[PDB]
Amino acid sequence: STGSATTTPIDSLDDAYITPVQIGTPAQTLNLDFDTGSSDLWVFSSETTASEVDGQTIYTPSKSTTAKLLSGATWSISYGDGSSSSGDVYTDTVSVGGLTVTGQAVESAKKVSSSFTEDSTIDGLLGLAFSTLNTVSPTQQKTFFDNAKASLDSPVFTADLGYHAPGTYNFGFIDTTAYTGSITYTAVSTKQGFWEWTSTGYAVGSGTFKSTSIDGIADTGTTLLYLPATVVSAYWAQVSGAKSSSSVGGYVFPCSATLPSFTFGVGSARIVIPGDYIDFGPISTGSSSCFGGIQSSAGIGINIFGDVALKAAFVVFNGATTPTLGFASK
Ligand SMILES: N=C1N=C(N)c2ccccc21
Ligand SMILES: N=C1N=C(N)c2ccccc21
Ligand SMILES: N=C1N=C(N)c2ccccc21
Ligand SMILES: N=C1N=C(N)c2ccccc21
C-alpha cells in the first residue's frame, strides 16, 4: 500500500501545515497537523468543551459506525510551545491520501488550551514520531505510521513541505521526481522517541562551512529552526540591525533586510535554506521589526530542525527495523 496527501500552509507565513485526514464511517474529514515530533493522533471532537471550540471541524464518534470507545483510556499532552490538550480515546478507521488503517487510536479532545482554540485552521494533530512517546494511558497506543508500516510497499514516509505553497506527504514510496540529486541517509537515535540525528555542520550565506556535530530532531510540527546559541549568533551577526530581544522572545531583524541563506550538513551533503525562508514577518501588525526563523535552542534543551529547515529539503523518514533519515535538495 501507499498513500499521498497534499499539505498546505495554514497562513501566509507557513506557521504550520495542515493535511486532510478521513476518520470514521462515513468519512469525517479533518485537517490535521502532521507532527514528526509527537506520537498522538488527537482531534477536536463533539466532546470538546464547547467554549474551547472556535471554528474547528470536529470529529463526532457517535456518527461513525466503525468508532468504538476504548474503555478507560485517556490521554494528555503538553507541547514545547506551552500548549496542551487531553481527553478520551476511540478506535476508528483512518485514511490519509488513500492509505487506510483500521483500528487506529483516535484521541478525542475533551479539553484544549487557548492557543488551540484560537487557531481555527488546525483540527488536531497526527503524530509521526515513535510510538514510545504516545500518551494514552493505561494502554499506550501506536501511531498511524506504526500501524500502517507492515502494509506499505516500503516502511517509509516522506515530507515535502512547500515554501508559501502546498507540498506533499507520501506513505510507502519515494517519489524520485520530487527532488534533485541523491538522497543522503543519516543515522537516527530513537532513544528519546524522536527522529533524532546529527548534522555535520553549517554555513551562513556564502561563508565557510563549519564542521561541527549538531544533534537535533527532524520535527515537522515545529515552525522554526532552533540551533545552539553560537550558531544562531553567527547567523544573525550577518544581518545589519538584528538583535536578540528579550521582550519579543528571540532574534528580530529589520523588515527591510534581505537575509542570507543558511546551510546545514547531512553527512557530506549540504541543504541550503534560502534567506527568505527565515523571514517570519512583522513582530506585531504594522511593525518594521521582523521575527527571525532561526532561534536559539539554549532554553529548550534540544536542537530542532523544524519546518524552516525541512521545507528546504525532500525528507525521508525511514521506519525500517533500524530507522534512518534521508535528505535531498529540491
Ligand atoms: N511546539 C511544538 N512542537 C511541536 N512538534 C508541536 C506540535 C503541535 C503544536 C505545537 C508544537
Ligand atoms: N508578504 C510581504 N508583505 C510585505 N509587505 C513584504 C515585504 C517584503 C517581503 C515580503 C512581504
Ligand atoms: N512587511 C514585511 N516585511 C518583511 N520582511 C515581511 C515578510 C513577510 C511578511 C511581511 C513582511
Ligand atoms: N514567536 C513569535 N513572535 C513573533 N513576533 C512571531 C512572528 C511570526 C512567527 C512567530 C513569532
239 & 272 share domain: yes
Q: Domain boundary residue among 120, 143, 174?
A: 174
Cell numbers found for residue 24: 470514521
How determined?
A: X-ray
- Determine which one of 14, 35, 219, 307 is catalytic: 35
Q: Domain boundary residue among 111, 146, 174?
A: 174
**Torsion, CA 170, CA 171, CA 172, CA 174, rounded to 10:** 20
Of the chain, the end-to-end C-alpha distance in Å amounts to 25
137 & 44 share domain: yes
113 & 187 share domain: no
207 & 276 share domain: yes
Testing ligand 1's pocket by substitution, the residue of 222, 300, 302, 307 carrying the most ligand atoms inside 8 A of its CB is: 222
**Torsion, CA 106, CA 107, CA 113, CA 115, rounded to 10:** -20
What count of other Cβ atoms lies within 10 Å of the Cβ of residue 2?
16
157 & 183 share domain: no
110 & 238 share domain: no
Concatenating the DSSP letter of every residue in 174-213 gives: --TTSSSS-PEEEE-B-TTSS-EEEEEEEEETTSPPEEEE
Q: Is the separation of the CB atoms in 149 and 155 below 8 Å?
A: yes
With a CB cutoff of 8 Å and minimum separation 6, the contacts of 315 are 158, 159, 160, 218, 325, 326, 327
Give the pairing type, strands 84-96 and 17-23: antiparallel
Provide residues with CB under 6 Å of ligand 3. Answer: 255, 279, 281-282, 290
Q: 9-40 b/e with 16+ CB inside 10 Å = b?
A: bbeeebbbbbbbbbbbeeebebbbbbbbbbbb
List beta partners, residue 94: 23, 101
CA distance 22 to 29: 4
180 & 95 share domain: no
Q: Please name the residue that has the C-alpha cell 514545547.
A: 80
19 & 106 share domain: yes
Q: What is the number of residues in the chain? A: 330
56 & 193 share domain: no
CA of 280 to the centre of ligand 2 (A): 10
166 & 204 share domain: no
Q: What backbone torsions phi and psi does residue 73 show, to the nearest 5 degrees?
A: -90, 135
Q: Is 199 a catalytic residue?
A: yes
- Determine which one of 199, 261, 296, 297 is catalytic: 199
Q: Is the separation of the CB atoms in 319 and 156 below 8 Å?
A: yes
Q: Is the separation of the CB atoms in 154 and 171 below 8 Å?
A: no
With a CB cutoff of 8 Å and minimum separation 6, the contacts of 100 are 1, 93, 94
136 & 238 share domain: no
For 25, the domain range is 5-174
Q: Is the separation of the CB atoms in 29 and 22 below 8 Å?
A: yes
20 & 159 share domain: yes
Q: Which ligand is nearest to the CA of 291?
A: 4
CA of 273 to the centre of ligand 1 (A): 21
The total domain count for the chain is 2
